[PDB]
Design a protein around this ligand. Sequence first.
Ligand SMILES: OC[C@H]1O[C@H](O[C@H]2[C@H](O)[C@@H](O)[C@H](OCCCCCCC3CCCCC3)O[C@@H]2CO)[C@H](O)[C@@H](O)[C@@H]1O
Length: 265
Amino acid sequence: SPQPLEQIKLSESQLSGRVGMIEMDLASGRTLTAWRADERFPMVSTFKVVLCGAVLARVDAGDEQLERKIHYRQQDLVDYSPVSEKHLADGMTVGELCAAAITMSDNSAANLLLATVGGPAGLTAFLRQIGDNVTRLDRWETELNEALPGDARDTTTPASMAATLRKLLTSQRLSARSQRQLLQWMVDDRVAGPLIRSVLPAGWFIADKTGAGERGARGIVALLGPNNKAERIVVIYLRDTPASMAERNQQIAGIGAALIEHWQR
Ligand SMILES: OC[C@H]1O[C@H](O[C@H]2[C@H](O)[C@@H](O)[C@H](OCCCCCCC3CCCCC3)O[C@@H]2CO)[C@H](O)[C@@H](O)[C@@H]1O
């Protein structure tokens, strides 16, 4: 594999789309690689990690409990609800809803949680409270994946998202138990985690949340490192590419391969 920046460039050439990428030390926030890091990209399903950070912040303040059972109706369900469609009779706890949203990208689970934090506006207000003045959620699932060209709704930047995930996982804004829970939800991703592990060399840690939307939109927020440690946050977004989902996956994986082959920077 070429150097990380060279591979990122090669990925834009091949996809005919924009890639945005930050690689950041988790413990310190050192930025190692930055490409289009201040440009906007649709968050797609990656927003669900920030969503559950807002939920945890409410838990820490005594305004929410992960145990609290939420009951909902079939009319509340939106497209792709693999866990939530099973619990119309018995409901789901707030914590179960976060696990379904993060580890299965259950869309109805995400909307149920979004309601509890004040909707898209509430989540954006939370972002501002933690010092992210750029990321914005405007819509609910699944309209937030529309990724129209030039539309600022439902976007982040690679630098903002990386700084925000660092803040949620490590800055002690959340309690120790809350930080540990958000991390464990990412470790438990069933959508992409096992697949990523199957192609990672032995010894590499992965935790992640991925997303996809229209017009080629794709995202991953991840923790990655050798020696089974969550050494770095890696955020990669793609937008405005006509490429197959397989090719977008292959290009993201190629960026990961360049990081692995040239880790010591
Ligand atoms: O010398 C480094 C390594 O080089 C290869 O590993 C390859 C591996 O066989 C391939 O499967 C992977 O694909 C990359 C898979 C990455 C998966 C997605 C990464 C995510 C994670 C973080 C967010 C961005 C993307 O690349 C590595 C590095 O070339 C060898 O197979 C392995 O024995 C050796 O230890």
